[PDB]
């Protein structure tokens, strides 16, 4: 009735409006692969530099 | 190198909320450790560094304090953490133990 | 799984020396430093002597200087402490402790040992 602007509608098919699935979730996702960086061999070592 | 607790004996029922105080002579830089010896056990270490709790088991033994004086105020105390709490600096090496302070029950 | 069992406790006399073998099981021994904490009857835990991760830094108590011998084996996964001369005073039972404290990884006294009831008699 809004869409025709009538509180009269006459009999048919008629296009009111849009239907959309609404998104569940959020995913994110980075590469497995470490590619871990050596502070390990400087944070912590048998000897540090004077 | 000398450390006092001042509460040696404290008897606090269920919920009492329980301080407990140990000031050291000299600066200790926020490195002490409290411990609470259950009779018949070894101790288990309850704070490091003063402020931090350590492996989590202990959950409402908040600690606090930097330089000379540092306290363990203990919050809802449950009947079974009854037992002697001890404090010790863990960074000066001649390290030392204070006498300690037993939560008993009333 | 983590564990510090001890070994060695029996009475020993006045004068005489029985190492005290702190076994290790679970960690690695090598970085962990180890140092040992005696609490005689009806007292307070008191400390004594410790080893670095290298087996190179022994520090010592001043209360007992030179009268122990703290040594780390790698391989073993033993600290090894013996006493010379034992006191009749330190008839505590002694505790093996593990300290990983200079690390940017680590806090003091993290597990603790079940204990070796040492005895001086006469």
């Known amino acids: 009735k809004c869409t025709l602007k009538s509180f009269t509608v006459e009999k048919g098919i008629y296009q009111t409006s849009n239907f959309r699935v609404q998104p569940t979730e959020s995913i994110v996702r980075f590469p497995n692969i470490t590619n871990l960086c050596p502070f390990d061999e400087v944070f912590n070592a048998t000897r540090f530099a004077s | 190198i000398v450390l006092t607790q001042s509460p040696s004996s404290l008897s606090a029922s269920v919920q009492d909320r329980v301080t407990i105080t140990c000031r050291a002579s000299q600066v200790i830089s926020n490195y002490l450790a409290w411990f609470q010896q259950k009779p018949g056990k070894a101790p288990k270490l309850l704070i490091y560094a003063a402020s931090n709790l350590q492996s989590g088991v202990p959950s409402r033994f908040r600690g606090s304090g930097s330089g000379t004086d540092f306290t363990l105020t203990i919050s809802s105390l449950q009947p079974e953490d009854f037992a002697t709490y001890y404090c010790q600096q863990y960074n000066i090496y001649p390290l030392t133990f204070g006498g300690g302070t037993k939560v008993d029950i009333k | 799984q983590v564990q510090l069992v001890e070994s060695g406790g029996g009475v020993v006399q006045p004068g005489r020396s029985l190492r005290l073998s702190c076994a290790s099981s679970?960690?690695?021994?090598?970085?962990?430093?180890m140092h040992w904490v005696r609490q005689p009857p009806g007292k307070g835990l008191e400390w004594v002597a410790f080893?670095?991760?290298?087996?190179?830094?022994?520090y010592y108590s001043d209360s007992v200087k030179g009268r122990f011998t703290i040594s780390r084996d790698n391989s073993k996964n033993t600290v090894y402490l013996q006493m010379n001369s034992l006191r009749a005073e330190d008839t505590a039972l002694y505790y093996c402790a593990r300290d990983s404290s200079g690390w940017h990884w680590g806090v003091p006294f993290d597990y603790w040992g079940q204990g070796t009831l040492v005895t001086v008699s006469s």
């Open positions: 080893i670095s991760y290298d087996g190179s830094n022994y």
């Open positions: 679970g960690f690695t021994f090598s970085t962990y430093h």
